[PDB]
């Protein structure tokens, strides 16, 4: 590893995603190859989240990638924001299509015409569908792997309900599942809140979100979104059902949509990665333990070399029995010192070393990836203390990252102390009037980069006392709003 | 119920089964179809089995970009020349025209192999075994048909690079065997292992192996899977090179393979086992293996007793889950039991379980097989054992009827007219073939020329399907092809296909 996180963050980031064998670059700007090491993280996320939403009655499906032009322009506010970043197909080989078709940036306009066909009676609701797929948002801002790419993987869940109390319940339920993905899996603390009128999803009523903080850059980044579309889409796609009471009074469904992307993997790297490679939380770590034989010299006993090789295979059989994910690295054309840095750069939480002097003494060495501690453990307590170190790494990664979040999430009441603490690489919660105009004025003023609205926190730090005005002086403060430079 | 009959009009029957089973919803873009949860669950079942198997082989999952530059796509000359007119091109983002059009992957050889070249610096980096589950686009000239032939479809593509041709060739047959297990052991569909002729092989590879399946209602075969040996045609173009320690200083090119399987699998399953009552799911891939419906709930039964009948249904549900049987308990109060029976018959659930009030105190229940309609009354105590035996027998007899259907419809002919007569009877034929491409086109036109079909069946000529690894009869020495102008090389399976 070359660069350092505190110095050049961008070059440290490009070095660790490639040398951990997560990312490979592509001759199309904004598109990055997910190599198996990275994809396994997305699979661990997918296995967790797929299991949790199917308890809620959501089923998996797959809708088409191509959107017709008529369907795209069905609702005018949704198509207004997404119009510039829609990639259009106009040709099949050398023959031009009669009408251009669009690659989905999101599937609201693809799925809901089918929702209208499937909802004939009251008994056809609720409809709860989810798909794992790729999406294209052609962003001409500078792309960055995982965090902001031209094409990314995600899940998008779309639900339709007869009542508003139903949709309101699911919006918060999905958001809590997104927080578990970041906190219980990726060991990343998040802030749950509500988007402002300026940053809310175009075509919905309100947008709940979770925000994460990247200390190395001082910038915040959105982790997940759970939108309440209300009736905005069902009115344009005619997802109707008869009212059980008044016959002939149409009722529009209440809808939600929610999405989680592979940016999770980038935020994992930017938060936990250090200057000696990736750091994987054990909950999503593809390989939790790697066993590496040590001390094998050219003149070593070939009979004992078989015995030392056998002892490494004895540890993996035991750790597999305790459902600890472990791979034994016995490749005979790589030095034991090369395997050290290889799995270090990859982020494996625990390295297990086996040497002749330790094998004969019924002992082995455990090397934690996060802190670098080396501990000699007897051969009997392998299934216990290694398991204990794994969740200790999980909690050490989380408490140290929450302590970073608590230090950099402070309160400010006027734009004097707001501009000061913002330029120190921290995010602040300021009294906000909620107007889309004052929101742009802050971002224009705080650049003299800028700071956007992140979320209106469900639980802010300080209780807004009556009489406190905004930072604009012309309007009262409606709520404390978390602000900061964002990705 | 179902209106169209599979034996009369197959197209309407297919369109009705895939919709009334809630598998397919249509879209406003031609050739693209919505995979509803009932169909998608099948694909996740195929995905779970095939993924566990290729990982035994050392293959790992990943995801490459769907966009291809024009230069990378055109590196292998004969590869792009075959796919060029069916590649979708992105030419503008919003209202802003792109300086250089980019392409949507019809397959990922040209996307991945620039990275393979970068990853292969020495012989220690080989082999490379990568696979991905993703979507591709093929804007084909043919008539689209849900599952079987769509403009966008879901699939898996595995791409492996080896240092020697022996290592690659072994993988080709290993994977083809897995595809055959997917069809024969999961979908209960018999298949024929063989290799494509020179005309039908993958453009850019050395040879193509394939599993061909047969659809008796249409008399047409369909390709279920391919496992290509690309040889070195791509590594010579993409510079996937290494230095063998035995041959000093000389550039060695990697031997590569690529293999694919698509969501066509679901349409073949539909076409083979479906009947005039709807879909028929093989129990190994059924989203729901057993559905439990409470019957006999009259308006005279008290709320206390009605809660006791639903509690017994849930008890049957919990017992079947403990023995790893995928079970749904349809306890909906807004649908009558008669609608529930037709609902789960159209969707193909292998076993319907009926629990009534008189049956509850009698300590018995009813099981109804979807494949035959046979009703059996089983004792409450022997439920976990009997139902598992029924599910297993359903899977066997589905495959057993399909295998006998294949046996009777796959015969051998040695003259051009006897091949013709058997071809127009709704069968596929193994004939002695000279192998050359120009003779296969002759067969394609001549069989379509001298075709005697029923009033309504359109003109369709026979094409190559595969050169079977184990043909029906040994080719006689000196035996000549069905054209009579060239010596025959092997028995080739011919017939009309999708
Ligand atoms: N080009 C991009 O914006 C992007 N690129 C790569 C990965 N994620 C991206 N967006 C984030 C996103 C998009 C859609 C729904 C939720 C989220 C969330 F992560 F913020 F929650
Ligand atoms: N547009 C199409 O050709 C198509 N559309 C939908 C589904 N499968 C399709 N082709 C079959 C196919 C393509 C690529 C690799 C293998 C196979 C196989 F299934 F035959 F093995
Ligand atoms: O793009 C979004 O944010 C919403 C949630 C996923 C589907 N559409
Ligand atoms: O399309 C094909 O047939 C090969 C195998 C999968 C990738 N390319
Ligand atoms: Sr062609
Ligand atoms: Sr040389
Ligand atoms: Zn203000
Ligand atoms: Zn011939």
Curated annotation (Swiss-Prot), chain A:
N6-acetyllysine sites (modified residues): 478
Binding site for Zn(2+): 433, 438, 470, 472
Outcome of substituting residue 137 to K: No effect on prolyl-tRNA ligase activity. Decreases inhibition by halofuginone
Binding site for ATP: 137, 139, 148-149, 222, 225, 261, 263
Subunit structure: Homodimer. Part of the aminoacyl-tRNA synthetase multienzyme complex, also know as multisynthetase complex (MSC), that is composed of the tRNA ligases for Arg (RARS1), Asp (DARS1), Gln (QARS1), Ile (IARS1), Leu (LARS1), Lys (KARS1), Met (MARS1) the bifunctional ligase for Glu and Pro (EPRS1) and the auxiliary subunits AIMP1/p43, AIMP2/p38 and EEF1E1/p18. Forms a linear complex that contains MARS1, EEF1E1, EPRS1 and AIMP2 that is at the core of the multisubunit complex. Interacts with TARS3. Interacts with DUS2L. Component of the GAIT complex which is composed of EPRS1, RPL13A and GAPDH.
Disease: Leukodystrophy, hypomyelinating, 15: An autosomal recessive disorder characterized by hypomyelinating leukodystrophy with thinning of the corpus callosum. Clinical features include motor and cognitive impairment appearing in the first or second decade of life, dystonia, ataxia, spasticity, and dysphagia. Most patients develop severe optic atrophy, and some have hearing loss.
Role played: Multifunctional protein which primarily functions within the aminoacyl-tRNA synthetase multienzyme complex, also known as multisynthetase complex. Within the complex it catalyzes the attachment of both L-glutamate and L-proline to their cognate tRNAs in a two-step reaction where the amino acid is first activated by ATP to form a covalent intermediate with AMP. Subsequently, the activated amino acid is transferred to the acceptor end of the cognate tRNA to form L-glutamyl-tRNA(Glu) and L-prolyl-tRNA(Pro).
Name of the protein described by the UniProt record: Bifunctional glutamate/proline--tRNA ligase
Organism encoding this protein: Homo sapiens (Human)
Gene name, Swiss-Prot/TrEMBL: EPRS1
């Amino acid at each position: 590893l070359e660069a350092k996180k505190e110095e050049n963050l961008a070059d440290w980031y490009s070095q660790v995603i490639t040398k951990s064998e997560m990312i490979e670059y592509h001759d199309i700007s904004g598109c990055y190859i997910l190599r198996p090491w990275a994809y396994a993280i997305w699979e661990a996320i997918k296995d967790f989240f797929d299991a949790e939403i199917k308890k809620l009655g959501v089923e998996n499906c797959y809708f088409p990638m191509f959107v017709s032009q008529s369907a795209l322009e069905k609702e005018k506010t949704h198509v207004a924001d997404f119009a510039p970043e829609v990639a259009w197909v106009t040709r099949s080989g050398k023959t031009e299509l009669a009408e251009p078709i669009a690659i989905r940036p999101t599937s609201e306009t693809v799925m809901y015409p089918a929702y209208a066909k499937w909802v004939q009676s009251h008994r056809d609701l609720p409809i709860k569908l989810n798909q794992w797929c790729n999406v294209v948002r052609w962003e001409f801002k500078h792309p960055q792997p995982f965090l902001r790419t031209r094409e990314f993987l995600w899940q998008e869940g779309h639900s339709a309900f007869a009542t508003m109390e139903e949709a309101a319940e699911e919006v918060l339920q999905i958001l809590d599942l997104y927080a578990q993905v970041y906190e219980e899996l990726l060991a990343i603390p998040v802030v749950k809140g509500r988007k402002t009128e300026k940053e809310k999803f175009a075509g919905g009523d309100y947008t709940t979100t979770i925000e994460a903080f990247i200390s190395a850059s001082g910038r915040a980044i959105q982790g997940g979104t759970s939108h309440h579309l209300g009736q905005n889409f069902s009115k344009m796609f005619e997802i109707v059902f008869e009212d059980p009471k008044i016959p002939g009074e149409k009722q529009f469904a209440y809808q939600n949509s929610w999405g989680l992307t592979t940016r999770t993997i980038g935020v994992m790297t930017m938060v936990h990665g250090d200057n000696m490679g990736l750091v994987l939380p054990p909950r999503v770590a593809c390989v939790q333990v790697v066993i590496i034989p040590c001390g094998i010299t050219n003149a070593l006993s070939e009979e004992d070399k078989e015995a030392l090789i056998a002892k490494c295979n004895d540890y993996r059989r035991r750790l597999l029995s305790v459902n600890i994910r472990v791979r034994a690295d016995l490749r005979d054309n790589y030095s034991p010192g090369w395997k050290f840095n290889h799995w270090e750069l990859k982020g494996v939480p625990i390295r297990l070393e086996v040497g002749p002097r330790d094998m004969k003494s019924c002992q082995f060495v455990a090397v934690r990836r996060d802190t670098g501690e080396k501990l000699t453990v007897a051969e009997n307590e392998a299934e216990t203390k290694l398991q204990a170190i794994l969740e200790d790494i999980q909690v050490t990664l989380f408490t140290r990252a929450s302590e970073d979040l608590k230090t950099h999430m402070v309160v400010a009441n006027t734009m004097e102390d707001f501009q000061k603490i913002l330029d120190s690489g921290k995010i602040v919660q300021i009294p906000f009037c909620g107007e889309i105009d004052c929101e742009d004025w802050i971002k224009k003023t705080t650049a003299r980069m800028g700071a956007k609205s992140l979320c209106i926190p469900f639980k802010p730090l300080c209780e807004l006392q009556p009489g406190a005005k905004c930072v604009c002086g012309k309007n009262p403060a409606k709520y404390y709003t978390l602000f900061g430079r964002s990705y």
